[PDB]
RNA sequence: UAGUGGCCUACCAUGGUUUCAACGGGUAACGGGGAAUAAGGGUUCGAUUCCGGAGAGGGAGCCUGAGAAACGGCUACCACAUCCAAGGAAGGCAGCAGGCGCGCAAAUUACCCAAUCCUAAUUCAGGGAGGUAGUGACAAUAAAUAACGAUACAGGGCCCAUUCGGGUCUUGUAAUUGGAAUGAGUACAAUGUAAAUACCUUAACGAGGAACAAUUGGAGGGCAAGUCUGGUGCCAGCAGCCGCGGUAAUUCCAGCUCCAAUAGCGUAUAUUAAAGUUGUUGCAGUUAAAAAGCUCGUAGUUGAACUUUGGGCCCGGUUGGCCGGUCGGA
């Protein structure tokens, strides 16, 4: 239809951005950059109705042009600016921090850390390659060339990727016992030292996937993440690790154990 | 629908222009004040051409003011009140019939009531109803309202096909008239 | 009728003459008195015309 | 066997068998040939409204005993003539010919009421203004 | 154009409008609760449509279903909420065995009457209405109420607009200023 | 506002606004609305700061009498209201000089009536001015 | 071409689709969640707040540009059609608010960027996208249109059952009551809002039945509710289907009076349901409509019977409880 799109209408954002229903006839339409359209989360939809540091959007801009709130070691000032998944964002505030990692409903949520990993970050190899003047290089989920890898790491692996300059000082293989993040799907959120692979040559290369709980699921395997050890993951995961309890048990949690 | 576009173009012939198209217009209030010398020039305050000008002491009753924005010649028949001789009897050419509704005299049941049994029962050309009250929109300040409903229900009380009657403190109103003969 | 003169009220005149139709008697106590009064008809003896009967009351 | 295939593949002939035996169905013939929009002079309507023709000549197809006021009348969404007729019956003095109606069936799309041919349609709203509160001696009821 | 808003339609017409013996019995709930229509009645009527339509739903697959163990287990954890449906006899199969007046009584349209300060189903019908009634702060100003098991304990009148005391009222001082005391103004 | 009960809960004190915004409780009981500028100059000496920094919406009732839930603000300085309060409500308080408009349709034909002439328009004040007059 | 390609083009080959329904025709056909349904299946509709497609009156065509076969862009044709000083010169409300015409059938030429957002070089500007107000019985929700005694009784009980002592309690007749008491409506007041309405708020003021009065359809069967009384006795009437009036009308005009639903009840068409009258579930063909004149036959639809039982070693997830050593549980 003539280019592109630039408006996104209410009840056609993804449900995890949890808008309501009411208030409104539109959704703030993230802009192009390090990430989908579909799992976005732009600068908006944290600040001022999650966070609820702005009351509307002349307030969240009010911020923006005020050079405050910093997503990844820069001083990013757009409304609609995709801050996605993994990104660490730090305040200029009272200086609190936070991360941009999911619950297990397949939505992000408040998570304020440290500051031995608000320093870094981490990322999917999406690829590995061989370009200009026979340079290899990795590109990461989000957006980052990477140059000068290490030749033993190929696709699928995982980074550490620091913030002050985008330097590699780490990674993880792929095989068996590796804690692990899904990335897409349905089991969104999840965890769990994956079991094995499986090939099919020409289509999906699904996974077997255990968790905490002993509780397998098969993902795909363009949404497998895989960022560990039995029991080591790197970075500080929020509350309630991930494991996904049943609506049975919290019936149990936020009826039986909280209601007395 | 051809067909029915040409039944939308011969009735196009008689009513449009002005080399014999100018039409009676014949204004006879239900009350004996509302006087229609301002109803002339009160409510044409909005149009604001000079149908103004001649609206004189030296009666005409051929008002041929083109007014310059629906173009089109005119003719409003400004009779007294008492001459009801004519009221009922030129009114064989008489298409536009205006009634003069006011609650400051209760429209009366030999007077105005019996004008309304009188130019009905002749057979109402065209009634397209006009509140012509200057001194009736501050009788009440406490949702005043009333002083038009009764009025616009009055209209429907015999001769319903006018849904609202209309107040002389809006601005289109009054080359809704023009829009209402043209 | 009398628009400004009688019924350009919504209602204080319905017709509120002490004059009544009927000998004043018009108070059908309106809504939930109404099918209170009717529950007293129907509740408390009575009976009228042996089970199958024709049609408003009156005599057999 | 019941005169039917049953077998787990035959289903090729049902929906076809089917198929040939809806058309024995009155209304499903009715319905898909659009023969309420190529006849049925409401055209699928509800309602019309259209000019009085004159007075009605009683030609007896069963019974109600009179010359019965009613009303030849011409639609002016279509212009197919067609007979018509009042409730509350009498009162023929107050509207002239080629003046206005609004119809609506009797029950059954008519049919049969009187002893008048094709009365179906009984009158609602005469030139804009209604019957119920003008039987109730607010106005008055027409003529043809 | 906005997110569209969703509405029900809450209440069952019958099949039989002319079915004696049903408006008979029908009748019969009308005086005695003090209420206003068949309406009224149809309100209580389609309630007990969805409720008896779900717990008829839900016997149907056998337990072992986690369903059948969450969302049975919270309607048979909420009627006894308002007071309606007893603790004693929950295991979703007496409530296909409760009724109209059950439903009907758990309402401050009753619980007016039946628990003291009541004086009739119309005089405290018409102080629902004249807000002479109370739960804990706030007048509950619908006879319909439904009273949620815990705020019967907490009936109390309005401090405002006495019979609760703190004041006198809107025709006291047309009287009370020219008769009860000033017939030596 | 007998029994006055001011009760400042659901504090946020937004340090990147210089704001302490919060909603507010008031028991009014036996009279009627607690106006802006009237809480306005009672909040504001006892929590903290001055009467320009004070902001006030919400604020309606609950049903019956006393209780009303508003919403206020208190900055922590003066010209912070200058410029991060929406101007409506220094109007509505006087902290702001109303700059009166015309419409908004006589603004949107004065837009379209000087979108029909390019440049500014001084020479038709002697270009048209002159030959027509003959 | 951005690129695959009969997409063309030049020579070749003679193919390809089909009774497994080609091809052709009609659609009152924009496709997907929805609706009415409600034993289940089936049925009919889907313009419509979301997604995708298409168009800016109908067909072409091209520029700028990352992006358009764009129309609040352009050129031409075709259909219209404005002013004119007779010399172009001007133009697309299938955007908003309005007009005409068409219908049965559908709002006000308001206020404003406060909000959801979008665009810009950009905290600042613009936004009929949008929100708010006005019309609005589409559809939906909750609820007005009024109290409790006393007093004359009727009783049902019943009090102590020496009931055989009168009324503790009520059913209504009671218009005789009895003062206290209030909202719809008018209002300071401030909240309410970008500015105002209202709506929770709130002091002052406004009720007695004449108050401040709830209508709408029926009143022969299906279909509750009189064979009541007058005028009416085929005269109209009444009838969705049947059925009465010819003079003893429960069915006519009226007076009563009553019956339902209740600020809501009718009517018109359309669909669904009951409708095993579409039947795969789940009909029917001797006579009620329906077995053919009888064989041969292809496609289709089915198609005879056979292929590793009985028992041992334990593991014991679950239950019976004499065990009860825990006094609802192993």
Same mark, same amino acid.
């Given at each position: 239809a003539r280019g592109p799109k630039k408006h996104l209408k209410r009840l056609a954002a993804p449900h995890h951005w949890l808008l309501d229903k009411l208030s409104g006839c539109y959704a703030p339409r993230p802009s192009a950059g390090p990430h989908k359209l579909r799992e976005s989360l732009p600068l908006i939809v944290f600040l001022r109705n999650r966070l609820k540091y702005a009351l509307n959007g002349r307030e969240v801009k009010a911020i923006l042009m005020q050079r405050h709130v910093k997503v990844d070691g820069k001083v990013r000032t757009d409304t609609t600016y995709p801050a996605g998944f993994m990104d660490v964002i730090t305040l200029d505030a009272t200086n609190?921090?936070?991360r941009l990692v999911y619950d297990v409903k397949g939505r992000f949520a408040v998570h304020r850390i440290t500051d031995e990993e608000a320093s870094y970050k981490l990322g999917k190899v999406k690829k590995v390659q061989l370009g200009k003047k026979g340079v290899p290089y990795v590109v990461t989920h989000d957006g980052r060339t990477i140059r000068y890898p290490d030749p033993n790491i190929k696709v699928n692996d995982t980074v550490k990727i620091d913030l002050a300059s985008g330097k590699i000082t780490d990674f993880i293989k792929f095989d068996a016992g590796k804690l692990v993040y899904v990335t897409g799907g349905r089991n969104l959120g999840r965890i769990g030292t994956i079991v094995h692979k499986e090939r099919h040559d020409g289509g999906f290369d699904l996974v077997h996937i255990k968790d905490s709980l002993d509780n397998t699921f098969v993902t795909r395997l363009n949404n497998v993440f895989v960022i560990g050890e039995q029991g080591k993951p790197y970075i500080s995961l929020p509350k309630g690790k991930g494991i996904k309890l049943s609506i049975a048990e919290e019936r149990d949690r936020r009826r039986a154990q909280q209601g007395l | 629908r051809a067909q029915r576009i040409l039944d939308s173009i011969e009735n196009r012939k008689l009513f449009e222009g002005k080399n014999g198209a100018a039409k009676i217009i014949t204004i006879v209030p239900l009350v004996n004040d509302l006087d229609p010398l301002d109803i002339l020039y009160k409510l044409l305050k909005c149009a604001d051409d000079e149908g103004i000008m001649v609206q004189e002491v030296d009666s005409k009753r051929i008002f041929n003011?083109?007014?310059?924005?629906?173009?089109?010649?005119?003719?409003?028949?400004?009779? *007294?009140?008492?001459?009801?001789?004519?009221?009922? *009897?030129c009114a064989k050419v008489a298409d536009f019939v205006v009634f003069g509704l006011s609650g400051v005299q209760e429209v009366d049941e030999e007077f105005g009531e019996q004008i309304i049994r009188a130019l009905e029962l002749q057979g109402i050309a065209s009634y397209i109803g006009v509140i012509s009250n200057l001194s009736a929109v501050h009788e009440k300040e406490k949702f005043q309202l009333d002083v038009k409903q009764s009025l616009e229900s009055y209209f429907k009380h015999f001769f319903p096909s006018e849904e609202r009657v209309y107040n002389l403190e809006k601005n289109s109103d009054a080359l809704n008239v023009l829009r209402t003969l043209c | 009728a009398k628009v400004h003169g009688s019924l350009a009220r919504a209602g204080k005149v319905k017709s509120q003459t002490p004059k009544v139709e009927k000998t004043e008697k018009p108070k059908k106590p309106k809504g939930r008195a109404y099918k209170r009064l009717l529950y007293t008809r129907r509740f408390v003896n009575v009976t009228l015309v042996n089970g199958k009967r024709r049609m408003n009351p009156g005599p057999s | 066997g019941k005169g039917k295939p049953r077998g787990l593949n035959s289903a090729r002939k049902l929906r076809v068998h089917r198929r040939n035996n809806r058309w024995a169905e009155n209304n499903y013939k009715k319905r898909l040939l659009g023969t309420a929009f190529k006849s049925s002079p409401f055209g699928g309507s509800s309602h019309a409204k259209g000019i009085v023709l004159e007075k009605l000549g009683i030609e007896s197809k069963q019974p109600n005993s009179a010359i019965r006021k009613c009303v030849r009348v011409q639609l002016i969404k279509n212009g197919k003539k067609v007979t018509a007729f009042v409730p509350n019956d009498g009162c023929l003095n107050f509207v002239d010919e080629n003046d206005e109606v609004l119809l609506a069936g009797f029950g059954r799309k008519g049919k049969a009421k009187g002893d008048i041919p094709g009365v179906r349609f009984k009158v609602v709203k005469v030139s804009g203004v209604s019957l119920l509160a003008l039987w109730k001696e607010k106005k008055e009821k027409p003529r043809s | 154009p906005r997110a569209p808003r969703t509405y029900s339609k809450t209440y069952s017409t019958p099949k039989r409008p002319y079915e004696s013996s049903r408006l008979d019995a029908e009748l019969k709930l009308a005086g005695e609760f003090g209420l206003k229509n068949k309406k009224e009645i149809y309100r209580i009527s389609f309630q007990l449509s969805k409720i008896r339509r779900a717990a008829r739903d839900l016997l149907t697959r056998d337990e072992k279903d986690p369903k059948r163990?969450?969302?049975?287990?919270?309607?048979?954890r909420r009627l006894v909420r308002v007071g309606v449906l007893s603790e004693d006899k929950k295991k979703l199969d007496y409530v296909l065995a409760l009724k109209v007046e059950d439903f009907l009584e758990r309402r401050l349209q009753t619980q007016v009457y039946k628990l003291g300060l009541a004086k009739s189903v119309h005089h405290a019908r018409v102080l629902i209405t004249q807000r002479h009634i109370a739960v804990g702060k706030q007048i509950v100003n619908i006879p319909s109420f439904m009273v949620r098991l815990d705020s019967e304990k907490h009936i109390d009148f309005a401090p405002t607009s006495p019979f609760g005391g703190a004041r006198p009222g809107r025709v006291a001082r047309r009287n009370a200023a020219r008769k009860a005391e000033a017939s030596g103004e | 506002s007998?029994? !006055?009960? %001011?009760?400042?809960?659901?504090? %946020? /004190?937004? #340090?990147?606004?210089?704001?302490?915004?919060?909603? !507010?409780?008031?028991?009014? #009981?036996?009279?009627?609305? !607690? /106006?802006?500028?009237?809480l306005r100059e009672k909040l504001a000496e006892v929590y903290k700061a001055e009467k320009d920094?004070?902001?006030?919406?919400?604020?309606?009732?609950?049903?019956?009498?006393?209780? /009303?839930?508003?919403?206020?603000?208190v900055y922590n300085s003066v010209a912070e209201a200058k410029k991060f309060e929406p101007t409506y409500r220094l109007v509505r308080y006087g902290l702001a000089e109303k700059v009166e408009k015309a419409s908004r349709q006589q603004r949107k034909q004065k837009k379209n009536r000087d979108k029909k002439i390019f440049g500014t328009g001084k020479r038709l004040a002697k270009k048209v001015a002159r030959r027509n007059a003959d």
């Open positions: 609190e921090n936070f | 003011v083109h007014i310059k924005k629906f173009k089109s010649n005119l003719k409003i028949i400004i009779p *007294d009140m008492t001459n009801f001789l004519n009221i009922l *009897d | - | - | 163990l969450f969302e049975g287990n919270a309607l048979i | 007998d029994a !006055v009960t %001011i009760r400042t809960r659901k504090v %946020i /004190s937004n #340090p990147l606004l210089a704001r302490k915004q919060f909603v !507010v409780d008031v028991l009014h #009981p036996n009279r009627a609305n !607690v /106006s802006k500028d009237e920094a004070v902001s006030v919406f919400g604020f309606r009732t609950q049903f019956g009498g006393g209780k /009303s839930v508003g919403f206020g603000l």
